[PDB]
Design an enzyme around this catalytic site. Structure first.
Site, PDB file in Angstrom:
ATOM      1  N   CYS A 105       0.866  -1.180   0.000  1.00  0.00           N
ATOM      2  CA  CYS A 105       0.000   0.000   0.000  1.00  0.00           C
ATOM      3  C   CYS A 105       0.905   1.235   0.000  1.00  0.00           C
ATOM      4  CB  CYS A 105      -0.961   0.003   1.195  1.00  0.00           C
ATOM      5  SG  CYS A 105      -2.062   1.454   1.196  1.00  0.00           S
ATOM      6  N   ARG A 108      -0.131   4.532   2.579  1.00  0.00           N
ATOM      7  CA  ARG A 108      -0.058   4.337   4.020  1.00  0.00           C
ATOM      8  C   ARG A 108       0.327   5.587   4.806  1.00  0.00           C
ATOM      9  NH1 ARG A 108       3.710  -0.453   4.804  1.00  0.00           N
ATOM     10  NH2 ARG A 108       4.395  -0.033   2.649  1.00  0.00           N
ATOM     11  N   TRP A 277      -9.059   5.942  -1.316  1.00  0.00           N
ATOM     12  CA  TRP A 277      -9.383   6.555  -2.595  1.00  0.00           C
ATOM     13  C   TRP A 277      -8.352   6.088  -3.608  1.00  0.00           C
ATOM     14  CZ3 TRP A 277      -8.495   9.738   1.715  1.00  0.00           C
ATOM     15  CH2 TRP A 277      -7.177  10.191   1.828  1.00  0.00           C
ATOM     16  N   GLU A 282      -3.783   3.221 -10.960  1.00  0.00           N
ATOM     17  CA  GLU A 282      -4.558   1.984 -10.898  1.00  0.00           C
ATOM     18  C   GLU A 282      -5.627   1.992 -11.966  1.00  0.00           C
ATOM     19  OE1 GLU A 282      -5.626   0.736  -6.751  1.00  0.00           O
ATOM     20  OE2 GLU A 282      -5.194   2.857  -6.296  1.00  0.00           O
TER      21      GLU A 282
HETATM   22  C1  HEM Z   1      -6.526   6.308   1.402  1.00  0.00           C
HETATM   23  C2  HEM Z   1      -5.847   6.163   0.260  1.00  0.00           C
HETATM   24  C3  HEM Z   1      -5.205   4.847  -0.278  1.00  0.00           C
HETATM   25  C4  HEM Z   1      -4.441   4.818  -1.371  1.00  0.00           C
HETATM   26  C5  HEM Z   1      -4.089   6.053  -2.232  1.00  0.00           C
HETATM   27  C6  HEM Z   1      -4.028   3.455  -1.601  1.00  0.00           C
HETATM   28  C7  HEM Z   1      -3.232   2.975  -2.606  1.00  0.00           C
HETATM   29  C8  HEM Z   1      -2.957   1.636  -2.828  1.00  0.00           C
HETATM   30  C9  HEM Z   1      -2.446   1.069  -4.056  1.00  0.00           C
HETATM   31  C10 HEM Z   1      -2.110   1.861  -5.321  1.00  0.00           C
HETATM   32  C11 HEM Z   1      -2.309  -0.250  -3.891  1.00  0.00           C
HETATM   33  C12 HEM Z   1      -1.814  -1.243  -4.951  1.00  0.00           C
HETATM   34  C13 HEM Z   1      -3.000  -2.020  -5.507  1.00  0.00           C
HETATM   35  C14 HEM Z   1      -2.763  -2.321  -6.966  1.00  0.00           C
HETATM   36  O1  HEM Z   1      -1.812  -1.750  -7.549  1.00  0.00           O
HETATM   37  O2  HEM Z   1      -3.534  -3.116  -7.562  1.00  0.00           O
HETATM   38  C15 HEM Z   1      -2.739  -0.585  -2.551  1.00  0.00           C
HETATM   39  C16 HEM Z   1      -2.756  -1.850  -1.994  1.00  0.00           C
HETATM   40  C17 HEM Z   1      -3.247  -2.178  -0.748  1.00  0.00           C
HETATM   41  N1  HEM Z   1      -3.812  -1.296   0.147  1.00  0.00           N
HETATM   42 FE1  HEM Z   1      -3.919   0.820  -0.074  1.00  0.00          FE
HETATM   43  N2  HEM Z   1      -4.578   2.685  -0.596  1.00  0.00           N
HETATM   44  C18 HEM Z   1      -5.313   3.491   0.239  1.00  0.00           C
HETATM   45  C19 HEM Z   1      -6.024   3.080   1.351  1.00  0.00           C
HETATM   46  C20 HEM Z   1      -5.976   1.871   1.986  1.00  0.00           C
HETATM   47  C21 HEM Z   1      -6.723   1.508   3.176  1.00  0.00           C
HETATM   48  C22 HEM Z   1      -7.708   2.458   3.887  1.00  0.00           C
HETATM   49  C23 HEM Z   1      -6.389   0.233   3.491  1.00  0.00           C
HETATM   50  C24 HEM Z   1      -6.874  -0.642   4.667  1.00  0.00           C
HETATM   51  C25 HEM Z   1      -7.598  -0.170   5.696  1.00  0.00           C
HETATM   52  C26 HEM Z   1      -5.410  -0.235   2.497  1.00  0.00           C
HETATM   53  C27 HEM Z   1      -4.797  -1.466   2.428  1.00  0.00           C
HETATM   54  C28 HEM Z   1      -4.166  -1.975   1.288  1.00  0.00           C
HETATM   55  C29 HEM Z   1      -3.818  -3.343   1.076  1.00  0.00           C
HETATM   56  C30 HEM Z   1      -4.069  -4.426   2.130  1.00  0.00           C
HETATM   57  C31 HEM Z   1      -3.258  -3.477  -0.125  1.00  0.00           C
HETATM   58  C32 HEM Z   1      -2.743  -4.784  -0.743  1.00  0.00           C
HETATM   59  C33 HEM Z   1      -3.923  -5.428  -1.462  1.00  0.00           C
HETATM   60  C34 HEM Z   1      -3.337  -6.425  -2.428  1.00  0.00           C
HETATM   61  O3  HEM Z   1      -2.237  -6.939  -2.093  1.00  0.00           O
HETATM   62  O4  HEM Z   1      -3.952  -6.709  -3.501  1.00  0.00           O
HETATM   63  N3  HEM Z   1      -5.189   0.784   1.605  1.00  0.00           N
HETATM   64  N4  HEM Z   1      -3.119   0.589  -1.945  1.00  0.00           N
HETATM   65  C1  LIG Z   2      -5.708  -1.596  -9.639  1.00  0.00           C
HETATM   66  N1  LIG Z   2      -6.152  -1.565  -8.232  1.00  0.00           N
HETATM   67  C2  LIG Z   2      -6.662  -2.885  -7.763  1.00  0.00           C
HETATM   68  C3  LIG Z   2      -6.477  -2.925  -6.255  1.00  0.00           C
HETATM   69  C4  LIG Z   2      -6.080  -4.080  -5.590  1.00  0.00           C
HETATM   70  C5  LIG Z   2      -5.876  -4.065  -4.220  1.00  0.00           C
HETATM   71  C6  LIG Z   2      -6.079  -2.897  -3.498  1.00  0.00           C
HETATM   72  C7  LIG Z   2      -6.493  -1.746  -4.162  1.00  0.00           C
HETATM   73  C8  LIG Z   2      -6.733  -0.486  -3.428  1.00  0.00           C
HETATM   74  C9  LIG Z   2      -7.312  -0.522  -2.167  1.00  0.00           C
HETATM   75  C10 LIG Z   2      -7.541   0.664  -1.493  1.00  0.00           C
HETATM   76  C11 LIG Z   2      -8.173   0.636  -0.135  1.00  0.00           C
HETATM   77  C12 LIG Z   2      -7.191   1.879  -2.080  1.00  0.00           C
HETATM   78  C13 LIG Z   2      -6.596   1.859  -3.343  1.00  0.00           C
HETATM   79  N2  LIG Z   2      -6.236   2.999  -3.943  1.00  0.00           N
HETATM   80  N3  LIG Z   2      -6.393   0.703  -4.007  1.00  0.00           N
HETATM   81  C14 LIG Z   2      -6.691  -1.767  -5.529  1.00  0.00           C
HETATM   82 CL   LIG Z   3      -9.215  -1.211  -8.979  1.00  0.00          CL
END
Ligand code: HEM
Ligand SMILES: CNCc1cccc(-c2cc(C)cc(N)n2)c1
Ligand SMILES: [Cl-]
Ligand code: HEM
Ligand SMILES: CNCc1cccc(-c2cc(C)cc(N)n2)c1
Ligand SMILES: C[C@H](O)[C@H](O)[C@H]1CNc2nc(N)[nH]c(=O)c2N1
Ligand SMILES: C[C@H](O)[C@H](O)[C@H]1CNc2nc(N)[nH]c(=O)c2N1
Ligand SMILES: [Cl-]
Ligand SMILES: [Gd+3]
Ligand SMILES: [Gd+3]
Ligand SMILES: [Zn+2]
EC number: 1.14.13.39
Lengths: 401, 401
Positions: A105, A108, A277, A282
């Site tokens: 993430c 974070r 958000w 993505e």
């Molecule tokens: C608030 C703004 C947030 C942004 C901008 C953000 C951004 C991202 C991005 C870009 C990814 C990569 C996913 C991908 O490329 O497919 C990610 C993964 C992840 N995020 Fe965040 N996220 C946010 C909030 C959160 C929140 C609120 C949580 C949990 C309470 C969280 C937990 C995770 C987890 C667990 C992953 C890994 C999921 C996976 O491995 O597929 N994120 N996040």
């Molecule tokens: C291409 N995104 C697929 C994907 C896969 C896993 C996680 C996300 C995610 C989750 C949250 C809470 C925010 C964010 N910005 N992304 C998105």
């Molecule tokens: Cl998505």
């Protein structure tokens, strides 16, 4: 203690926090499997023991009155019931921590600003649906998005799991076509089929929002349509390419992952959807340009008059960059929170610094932190990272079908 | 115990059995992944034996004729001398195999096509210089670039080392000022400081080709002025941005790495400069746009009248694509061999498939194979990869001071 260099500046730190990495990842000294996408009462006790330790460190009351009682409480409860119950504040701290600990993430920096909805008293699929609508409603907030998570009842002996079958609360149907292709999102062919099988009347658009398949314990999944007005979407246009609106592309406002398991002190919450958000890449790069997704890159480049017959013209790069521009602009136009990969990665660099002063390091998956376009243009490219598993945590789990 | 490797664009699965051979332990443990980090007597006989058994199996000559023969003469050679000399063909087979095994090299589809110059009878810095100059002029070949490695004498105790003190044979100067900041290339400030510290007249400009510091065994090193007619450079212009030429940017034709330690059959050549041709993102993205490198991104964006006031204009992304377009355009106009990151990664996918057929796998450092721009636009992004160390190999080595 792994030494970590930032190549843009010359900064050097040592990730001492990696030494607390409890569970094991996939890499050995023989081979690195970093790039892979998918890598008993006493053990429940040591996990719980540790998390409670963690929680009492955070409230600045480590080794204090409440600390000892909670340990002996949890042990007596695990002895008596085989399991234990998190207090509400422990639950808020374990959901924030699990976001803090999420190596993949980039968002974070926000890990402390997290709205935790305690749905552990949920009783049915139907109540589950109501909690989820209120999550979506709270988070979407008319486009001023708020980070939130709803913790549904924990796995416990004697009852099946609560499950959200959908990988995300908002997903687009993927209909396998007549001529073997996909209409809509090819990543969602399986879940679409399951919905149809479970009596969903399919549409035939490219951006048909999927119904929810919600499993109450020891129940078949149940199908719940989301009210259209709950699902805030964003029509995609380009600030200068006016033909771009004629592509009919849309994306939704709320990224709410609904298929991950939340782990806190050895307890397992198989249903705890979380939302933040989007980061524009993505949507703009992955969701729309992945060859196995909406795969619009060539159509945009053709429309852009780019020469798509040679790769050296960088028509892929040029067309992708304007798709990301369109996503950013479309979301600002619609007043829906969105962060671009430059802003996101630069706040993640602050997160790594805050985390270094706070915990002596930060678990980070470089290949997931680095954006899928313009990688070395962002500062996280030139930051070495130490990836490892801390708990509390969001883990992957097998699909319930 | 056989890593499952998926490709997420197609869905195909392979297993890396080749990973079972990994000699030198990697940096990663079950508890932490360090793949994103850049720089993490008769033992000689084990590596000697293994490499010879490789060679003969590769020429379909396992267990017959010269196999046992060549085994004896190295058993005898090490017995007598405590070392051994490579048969010419083996030094060729080892150079090709090291390239084949370089996990971070994305151009390994070319691994079978390599010219090995044998400088094992080298003595004195003046000797290397002509060997290097032969290589350079051979490799350059008036722009139709040809891969080559010049292997200087191996290593023995009680003797010095053969070392090229530069990281590359062509490197640009980097000069400080009455304010510390650098004119020229900051990645070479140090060796630029050495070259002047060894009596080189420093230039003024931002693209002065550094003189070589060549070192003969047990001897302080000698300065060498490369023949200007021998340093093929490409003035950078842009196909349609007429002012890009005015920015005065150039890069050299020949990427020649002169600081890595070739290792074949347990023999260590600390001076074995190899060279290929560039991939355009090396120059256009890393070299020109990295903030610690030429850092031209903002300059180019000003000239394009981009909005540098907001990160979400993607002005960084837009100006970086154009810098890459200039690189590809300029090299092609100068008829200098160059490969764009799309062509290159696509060939690497072709390579991975060849290697899956040939050796059942391929060590690949995901983070270095994915190009630094437009990552998920290239197929290697969606390809899982296994990173391990095979012999023979190119290794990093301490700076010779
Ligand atoms: C608030 C703004 C947030 C942004 C901008 C953000 C951004 C991202 C991005 C870009 C990814 C990569 C996913 C991908 O490329 O497919 C990610 C993964 C992840 N995020 Fe965040 N996220 C946010 C909030 C959160 C929140 C609120 C949580 C949990 C309470 C969280 C937990 C995770 C987890 C667990 C992953 C890994 C999921 C996976 O491995 O597929 N994120 N996040
Ligand atoms: C291409 N995104 C697929 C994907 C896969 C896993 C996680 C996300 C995610 C989750 C949250 C809470 C925010 C964010 N910005 N992304 C998105
Ligand atoms: Cl998505
Ligand atoms: C023929 C076309 C070639 C292309 C397009 C190419 C491209 C590349 C690129 C882009 C990298 C990443 C390094 C960086 O970005 O800093 C790399 C690394 C590397 N290449 Fe290749 N290369 C070619 C030929 C060769 C040859 C002939 C050799 C040796 C015989 C070689 C050996 C290596 C090694 C050892 C590395 C890793 C070096 C390091 O870690 O710094 N390459 N190559
Ligand atoms: C910005 N890259 C620096 C760097 C570092 C290490 C190696 C290279 C290299 C080597 C060869 C033989 C071809 C090529 N295309 N690159 C380049
Ligand atoms: C195969 C490869 O590991 C895979 O495509 C990864 C690479 N890095 C990623 N990084 C992010 N943030 N999201 C992803 O889905 C992926 N996919
Ligand atoms: C910190 C990070 O590991 C480092 O910047 C690496 C990442 N990937 C790279 N990839 C290539 N091809 N060249 C590089 O210098 C780097 N740098
Ligand atoms: Cl270079
Ligand atoms: Gd217009
Ligand atoms: Gd003007
Ligand atoms: Zn690893």
């Amino acid at each position: 203690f792994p030494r970590v260099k930032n190549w843009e500046v010359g900064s050097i730190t040592y990730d001492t926090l990696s030494a607390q990495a409890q569970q094991d990842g996939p890499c050995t000294p023989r081979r690195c499997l970093g790039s892979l996408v998918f890598p008993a009462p006493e053990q429940l006790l040591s996990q719980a023991r540790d998390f409670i330790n963690q929680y009492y460190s955070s409230i600045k009351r480590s080794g204090s009155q409440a600390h000892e009682q909670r340990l002996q409480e949890v042990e007596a409860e695990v002895a008596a019931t085989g399991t234990y119950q998190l207090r509400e504040s422990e639950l808020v701290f374990g959901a924030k921590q699990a976001w803090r600990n999420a190596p993949r993430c980039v968002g974070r920096i926000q890990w402390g600003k997290l709205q935790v909805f305690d749905a552990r008293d949920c009783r049915s699929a139907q109540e589950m649906f109501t909690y989820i609508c209120n999550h979506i409603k709270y988070a979407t907030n008319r486009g001023n998005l708020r980070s939130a998570i709803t913790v549904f009842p924990q796995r416990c002996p004697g009852r099946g799991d609560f499950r959200i079958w959908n990988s995300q609360l908002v997903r687009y149907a993927g209909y396998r076509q007549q001529d073997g292709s996909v209409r809509g999102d090819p990543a969602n062919v399986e879940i679409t089929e399951l919905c149809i099988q479970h009596g969903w009347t399919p549409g035939n658009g490219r951006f048909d929002v999927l119904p929810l398949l919600l499993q109450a314990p020891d129940e078949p999944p149940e199908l719940f349509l989301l009210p259209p007005e709950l699902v805030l979407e964003v029509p995609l246009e380009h600030p200068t390419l006016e033909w771009f609106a004629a592509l009919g592309l849309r994306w939704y406002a709320l990224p709410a992952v609904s298929n991950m398991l939340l782990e806190i002190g050895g307890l397992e919450f198989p249903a705890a959807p979380f939302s933040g958000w989007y980061m524009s890449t993505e949507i703009g790069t992955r969701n729309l340009c992945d060859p196995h997704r909406y795969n619009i890159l060539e159509d945009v480049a053709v429309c852009m008059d780019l020469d798509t017959r040679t790769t050296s013209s960088l028509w892929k790069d040029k067309a992708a960059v304007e798709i990301n521009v369109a996503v950013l602009h479309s979301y600002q136009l619609a007043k829906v929170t969105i962060v671009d990969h430059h802003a996101a990665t630069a706040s993640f660099m602050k997160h790594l610094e805050n985390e270094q002063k706070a915990r002596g390091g930060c678990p980070a998956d470089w290949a997931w932190i680095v954006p899928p376009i313009s990688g070395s243009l962002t500062p996280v490219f030139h930051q070495e990272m130490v990836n490892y598993f801390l708990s509390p945590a969001f883990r992957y789990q097998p699909d319930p079908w």
